[PDB]
Scaffold this active site. Structure first.
Site, PDB file in Angstrom:
ATOM      1  N   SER A 183      -0.147  15.762 -11.814  1.00 45.50           N
ATOM      2  CA  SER A 183      -0.346  15.417 -13.244  1.00 45.50           C
ATOM      3  C   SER A 183      -0.549  16.688 -14.061  1.00 45.50           C
ATOM      4  O   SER A 183      -1.086  17.677 -13.535  1.00 45.50           O
ATOM      5  CB  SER A 183      -1.531  14.479 -13.369  1.00 45.50           C
ATOM      6  OG  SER A 183      -1.911  14.282 -14.693  1.00 45.50           O
TER       7      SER A 183
ATOM      8  N   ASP B  55       0.838  -1.197   0.000  1.00 44.83           N
ATOM      9  CA  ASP B  55       0.000   0.000   0.000  1.00 44.83           C
ATOM     10  C   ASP B  55       0.867   1.239   0.000  1.00 44.83           C
ATOM     11  O   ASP B  55       1.311   1.632   1.094  1.00 44.83           O
ATOM     12  CB  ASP B  55      -0.931  -0.002   1.191  1.00 44.83           C
ATOM     13  CG  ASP B  55      -1.853   1.186   1.211  1.00 44.83           C
ATOM     14  OD1 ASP B  55      -1.930   1.911   0.184  1.00 44.83           O
ATOM     15  OD2 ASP B  55      -2.539   1.368   2.271  1.00 44.83           O
TER      16      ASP B  55
END
Length: 330
Positions: free
Chosen positions: A199, A35
């Site tokens: 992004s 994770d």
């Protein structure tokens, strides 16, 4: 040193991925969910409330010659999905894919929430976010990666998740055979303890690329791609009959649909998520309503590049003094 382990989807939807991990002496092999959005290594154990164990493999510290109670230490964690677990702590030897750490904090669950009990395939979590998020008290503990780092050939791990197929987690090296083209690296903020990056934009299907900054985290422990409501509406507007259902808890679409791809930007590079990666199948068994793999982050407080996005790429988690993320096509 290096390590290399295969990671395998738990089910036919790629809801999560499990990776075998050796704990203790002699080794006890547990299948953990790696994770990159949390920082605790915790396991089902001989201490877990018996009614909360349903088919998981447990760690039994009393059978490990190298286990030691970390006296006084406790932990308690709550995840983005509302699941939780808590317990006490042992140090022990932990190996992933041939890479061994001695003295790793192994958080032994006394209690787990219902979603953990109900998932017999996941024996615990191995956190790979920054150790500032580790929940052990009163002495915060290091992740497996942070403890291994100084021993690794390069202070990196890579995630290569499969679409309906096994993939790989590597530690300490970058497999130049595992991706196509070049790796594009992007800056990381560790301010929130995550692999948080920005992004450079997105496209829907064959549509034009929209240049827009989207801050979010690279989270292998989250199934879906959670993005701003504007971006998510623009995607699902291209699917006939798609809608946001408050009863189901997100966007659904006709199972008869063909889904468009979704592209996200990494610097001047582009990662394309094929439309089939975004299909999470019937909302209930036999339904002709299917659950979408791109969902709004509006009710989270962060954008999450979960497995839907990450499995479209070869992803480098660079834990150098200045951390960075890398993405390559594959």
């Amino acid at each position: 040193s290096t390590g290399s382990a295969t990671t395998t989807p738990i089910d036919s939807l790629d809801d999560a991925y499990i990776t075998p991990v050796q704990i203790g002496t002699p080794a006890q092999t547990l299948n953990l969910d790696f994770d990159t959005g949390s920082s605790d290594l915790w396991v089902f154990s001989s201490e877990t409330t018996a009614s909360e164990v349903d088919g998981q493999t447990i760690y039994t510290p009393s059978k490990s010659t190298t286990a030691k109670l970390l006296s006084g230490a406790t932990w308690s964690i709550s995840y983005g999905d509302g699941s939780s677990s808590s317990g006490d702590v042992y140090t022990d030897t932990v190996s992933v894919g041939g890479l061994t750490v001695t003295g790793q904090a192994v958080e032994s669950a006394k209690k787990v929430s219902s979603s953990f009990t109900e998932d017999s395939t996941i024996d615990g979590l191995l956190g790979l976010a920054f150790s500032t998020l580790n929940t052990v008290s009163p002495t915060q503990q290091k992740t497996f990666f942070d403890n291994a780092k100084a021993s690794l050939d390069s202070p990196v791990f890579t995630a290569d998740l499969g679409y309906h197929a096994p993939g790989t987690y590597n530690f300490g090296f970058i497999d130049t055979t595992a991706y196509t083209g070049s790796i594009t690296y992007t800056a990381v903020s560790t301010k929130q303890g995550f692999w948080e990056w920005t992004s450079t934009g997105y496209a829907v299907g064959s549509g034009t690329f929209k240049s827009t900054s989207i801050d979010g985290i690279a989270d292998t422990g989250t199934t879906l791609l959670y993005l701003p409501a504007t971006v998510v509406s623009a995607y699902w507007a291209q699917v006939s009959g798609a809608k946001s259902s408050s009863s189901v808890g997100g966007y659904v679409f006709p199972c008869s649909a063909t889904l468009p791809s979704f592209t996200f930007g990494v610097g001047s590079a582009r990662i394309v998520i094929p439309g089939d990666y975004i299909d999470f199948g019937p909302i209930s068994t036999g339904s002709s309503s299917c659950f979408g793999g791109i969902q709004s982050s509006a009710g989270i407080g962060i954008n999450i590049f979960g497995d839907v996005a990450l499995k479209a790429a070869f992803v480098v988690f660079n834990g150098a003094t200045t951390p960075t993320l890398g993405f390559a096509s594959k």
